[PDB]
Every structure is written in structure tokens, then in C-alpha cells.
Write a new protein. Structure first.
Length: 135
């Protein structure tokens, strides 16, 4: 169960927050307030895919990820460099569970550099810290 001090410690360590299930859930709540939650949803989907070996499951999950977050027509599309997308598009024709690893790192970095600082300045972050303090 995350304490006030744990929630506060995340302000100096994005990696620590992202390792914590509560860190990811609290961050997600914030991201939805600024309509950038697709980045984290994609990141989580990629984490889940990496744990699969069954070919049908890999195919179905890889294609779902593409359709939800990669296709230029998806409403939950994430922002990726053209070289990353090119390699994804080739891999889509023969899916493997590591095919989103580069895109995952790109989106992690985006979250770290762009939305994370805004999280730390948000009233919702203040309220998270204060909701777990026993004062
Ligand atoms: Ca959005
Ligand atoms: Ca396999």
C-alpha cells in the first residue's frame, strides 16, 4: 500500500513510479485528465505482449495493438518516428512478441519528458499525496 512518502518519492524518480502498480494507476488517472492516456495504455499493452509465446495470442494481441495505437486512423494512435513505424508495419505481417520494444521505449521517454512534469504540478498529484497522509 503506497504511503505519502512513496508517492512523493516519485517526483524524483519516474522509473520508480513506473515500476509500482499504484504509480502506473495514479499516473493513468492524471493522463486521462489531459487526454494523453493512450501513451500509457499502449505502453501497458506492450508489456503484456512481451510475456506471450503462443502464436495465436501474439498475432491477436499484436494486431489489436496496431489497430488501437499504431494505425494512422486509430483514435488512440500514439506518436512514433517514421523509422519505428516502418519496422512495425513489416513485423505486422509476421508478428513476434518483441516487435513493439522500440516503440515502447519511445513512448516511455515521451511520458517521462512531457506528461510526467505536468503530473507533478497538478492538483490531482497534490490530492493523491494528501489522500494517503494520516496526519
Ligand atoms: Ca489523446
Ligand atoms: Ca511461439
Amino acid at each position: 500500500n503506497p504511503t505519502a512518502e512513496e508517492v512523493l518519492s516519485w517526483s524524483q524518480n519516474f522509473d520508480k513510479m513506473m515500476k509500482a502498480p499504484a504509480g502506473r494507476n495514479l499516473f493513468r488517472e492524471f493522463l486521462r485528465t489531459e487526454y494523453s492516456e493512450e501513451n500509457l495504455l499502449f505502453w501497458l499493452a506492450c508489456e503484456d505482449l512481451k510475456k506471450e509465446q503462443n502464436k495465436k495470442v501474439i498475432e491477436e494481441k499484436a494486431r489489436m495493438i496496431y489497430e488501437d495505437y499504431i494505425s494512422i486512423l486509430s483514435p488512440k494512435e500514439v506518436s512514433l518516428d517514421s523509422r519505428v513505424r516502418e519496422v512495425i508495419n513489416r513485423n505486422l505481417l509476421d508478428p513476434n512478441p518483441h516487435m513493439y520494444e522500440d516503440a515502447q521505449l519511445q513512448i516511455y521517454t515521451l511520458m517521462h519528458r512531457d506528461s510526467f512534469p505536468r503530473f507533478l504540478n497538478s492538483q490531482i498529484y497534490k490530492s493523491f499525496v494528501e489522500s494517503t497522509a494520516g496526519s
